Amino acid sequence: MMLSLNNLQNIIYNPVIPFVGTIPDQLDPGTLIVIRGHVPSDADRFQVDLQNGSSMKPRADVAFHFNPRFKRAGCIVCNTLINEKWGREEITYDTPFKREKSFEIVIMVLKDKFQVAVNGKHTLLYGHRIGPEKIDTLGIYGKVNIHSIGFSFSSHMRLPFAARLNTPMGPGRTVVVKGEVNANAKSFNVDLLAGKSKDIALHLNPRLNIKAFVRNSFLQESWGEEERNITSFPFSPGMYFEMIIYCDVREFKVAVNGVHSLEYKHRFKELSSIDTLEINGDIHLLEVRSW
Ligand SMILES: CC(=O)N[C@H]1[C@H]([C@H](O)[C@H](O)CO)O[C@@](O[C@H]2[C@@H](O)[C@@H](CO)O[C@@H](O[C@H]3[C@H](O)[C@@H](O)[C@H](O)O[C@@H]3CO)[C@@H]2O)(C(=O)O)C[C@@H]1O
Ligand SMILES: OC[C@H]1O[C@@H](O[C@H]2[C@H](O)[C@@H](O)[C@H](O)O[C@@H]2CO)[C@H](O)[C@@H](O)[C@H]1O
């Protein structure tokens, strides 16, 4: 894995090790845990532990033991601790971790397993031995320096929604959003803005109360001329939808549920400067995909 969208919540910076912190939400499937740091020049071993509570006597059960160890070979040791007793070790060699090297660990929770990627490469999978609903604390021990920890939950898609685009906007770039208009929705908006110039390159504003689709750009602290022509208002309150914002060389092509909706001639000509996605309004956000 390698997150295309940066929308981590509850960002933690430079935590002191050992760090024992409460996971601010339940680890439901689709949940991501992102840990960034580096291995000190001495480091013999360190561990990331998803635990059920933080009692240390008796030692809290460790639902998921992620234990990178540095030795001749070099590996990542995984296990589970119930009633202070270790279960069967699952060991992965060809360790992505190395001394004096920085890393990004993405721990993804699946219905039946944890899937782990380190530095954009798949590293290992881990079957749940303890229900994940029982995990509420993150423990980090050993010789490792933590720069930042971040999370992505179900609420991670709560509104207002803001997210950075880890891949510059440019021709061929697609952005899709799936969601559902609320039953009594007035309107909602999806914007592509340029963080730098705090400009709104594309403002897609479906308004359900007036059955119209306002499209415009906000540049130089000002709204331009609106674009509302459309063969037919595609949105209806309470309706599930998927929207495709496709950036092309001269304009944006936007479709809803597999049917073309409109085109929008680029007003912000620095396509690459479009590094932000904002979603807000009267809808239920279900999914967002950059690429
Ligand atoms: C030294 C200390 O302060 N406590 C350690 C503990 C203790 O060594 C003791 O195990 C407490 O019960 O070890 C901790 O790491 C252990 C953990 O990584 C488990 C995971 O399987 O392995 C233990 O070592 C194994 C070893 O991998 C096997 O090859 C061997 O056959 O058995 C050993 C023990 O079963 C690690 O020591 C721990 O959290 O329990 C780290 C503490 O800081
Ligand atoms: O242009 C998008 C921008 O519109 C603002 O509202 C406008 C409205 O679109 C226009 O038809 C009317 O004449 O003037 C309103 C006041 O500017 C929204 O407030 C803003 O959020 C965007 O949606």
Has 291 been labeled as part of a binding site? no
Task: Point out the ligand nearest to the CA of residue 216.
Answer: 2
Beta partners for residue 104, in sequence order? 36
Between the CA of 44 and the centroid of ligand 1 the distance, in Å, is 13
Sorted by where each begins, the domain ranges of the chain are 1-153, 154-291
Does the 154-291 domain belong in CATH 3.30.910.10?
no
- Which residue type is seen at 64? F
What is the residue with the minimal CA distance to atom 26 of ligand 1?
89
Reported resolution, Å = 3.0
Between the CA of 118 and the centroid of ligand 1 the distance, in Å, is 23
* Phi, psi of 139, deg, nearest 5: -115, 135
Task: Point out the ligand nearest to the CA of residue 89.
Answer: 1
Tell me the CA distances in angstroms from 7 to 160, 225, 247, one per residue in order: 12, 31, 21
Same fold, 1-153 and 154-291: yes
What is the CATH code of the structural domain delimited by 1-153? 2.60.120.200
Method used to obtain the model:
X-ray
163 half-sphere exposure, CB direction, 13 A CA radius = 27
Position in ligand 2 atom list of the atom nearest CA 223: 1
Has 223 been labeled as part of a binding site? yes
d(CA 100, CA 202): 43
217: enclosing H helix or E strand: strand 212-219
What is the residue with the minimal CA distance to atom 12 of ligand 2?
226
d(CA 79, CA 86): 7
d(CA 40, CA 90): 25
What is the DSSP pairing of strand 32-38 with strand 19-22? unpaired
